[PDB]
Structure 1
Amino acid sequence: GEVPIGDPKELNGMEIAAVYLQPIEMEPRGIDLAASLADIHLEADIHALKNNPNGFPEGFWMPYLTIAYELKNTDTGAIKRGTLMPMVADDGPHYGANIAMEKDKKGGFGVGNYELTFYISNPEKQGFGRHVDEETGVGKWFEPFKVDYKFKYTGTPK
């Protein structure tokens, strides 16, 4: 029951797609918003492309990325921010977070037209190294960037 969010982007040797589905229960507790307090679960699917400049195989999950998001309702004008934390599900690893939409007590996060922005920084920010030697070395990481999406939130799918 995954609803697609806009069109996927291909940049910095990665494919960056967005989806959302029913809220999910995550361990460890206390890091994420609880399932009952949320309406959706946002996910960032980031996998390596062909000939990734940082040495990642095609289709491999891009790990240790630092992802912040910004969800804007174009109609009501409401904006919220958070972070997508790394986790694994039955369809493998991803970056995600439970998000309150209708249940957001501030309001203006119900059914409507939206803009989603990711803010991604490379793995070195989290202590992930890379070889730079002649034989096995890879190229420089990307500078912090962002990708914009546009989608229509049709309501909670739970």
Structure 2
Amino acid sequence: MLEYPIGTPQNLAGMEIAAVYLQPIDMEPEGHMRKASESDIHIEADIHALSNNPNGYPEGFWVPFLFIKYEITKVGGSGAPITGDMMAMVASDGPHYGDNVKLQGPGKYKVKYTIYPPNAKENPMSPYYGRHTDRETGVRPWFKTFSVEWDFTYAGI
């Protein structure tokens, strides 16, 4: 697959957090994504387990059932961020968190993701994902909600 990286990946709580973008996409179920024709990019959060992940994920595994909120701000622009929620989905290169986004033209942008664990109150998937807690097969508690930021230059794609 072809993609454009946003800065350098960041490591927290036994996970690698990377930001990427590509052209707007089409998704099933329809009507969840902003129409490809009314967007500039498809923004994505690539979250994979590092070695010795404390929540039982083997290295390189996709970290599922997370909830991601983003804020995108143009440097030198209005000052008001472009906000939204990402959705979990699968593409030809595998599962990820993404959203179709309309930007404010070419320039430098600041990107911030707020990453919610499976048990967060804000996470709508919390009733559907468990975690073993017994000695034999149990794992460490979930990480706390955190935020991650990068800068990037958008030219149009």
Same fold (TM over 0.5): yes
Q: TM-score, normalised by structure 2?
A: 0.92
Which amino acid in 2 is paired with 1:114? Answer: Y
Which residues of structure 1 form unaligned runs of 5+?
Answer: 102-108
Structure 1 match to 2:140 = 139
Structure 2 residue corresponding to 1:118, chosen from 90, 107, 113: 113
SS state at 1:6 partner: strand
Structure 2 residue 100 is matched with structure 1 residue 98: yes
Structure 2 residue 35 is matched with structure 1 residue 34: yes
Cα distance in structure 2, aligned partners of 1:118 and 1:34: 22
> Superposition pairs for residues 5-84 of structure 1, below 5 Å?
5-76=6-77, 77-84=79-86
Which amino acid in 2 is paired with 1:95? Answer: Y
The number of residue pairs the alignment matches comes to 149
Q: CA RMSD in A?
A: 0.9
Deviation at 1:39, TM superposition (A): 0.9
Structure 2 match to 1:105 = none
Q: TM-score, normalised by structure 1?
A: 0.91
Cα distance in structure 2, aligned partners of 1:52 and 1:149: 23
Cα distance in structure 1, aligned partners of 2:80 and 2:107: 11
Cα distance in structure 1, aligned partners of 2:141 and 2:96: 23
Which amino acid in 2 is paired with 1:82? Answer: G
Deviation at 1:78, TM superposition (A): 3.7
Cα distance in structure 1, aligned partners of 2:140 and 2:40: 41
Deviation at 1:81, TM superposition (A): 0.6
Which residues of structure 2 form unaligned runs of 5+?
Answer: 121-125
Cα distance in structure 1, aligned partners of 2:8 and 2:76: 20
Deviation at 1:70, TM superposition (A): 0.3
Cα distance in structure 1, aligned partners of 2:76 and 2:8: 20
Cα distance in structure 2, aligned partners of 1:54 and 1:86: 19
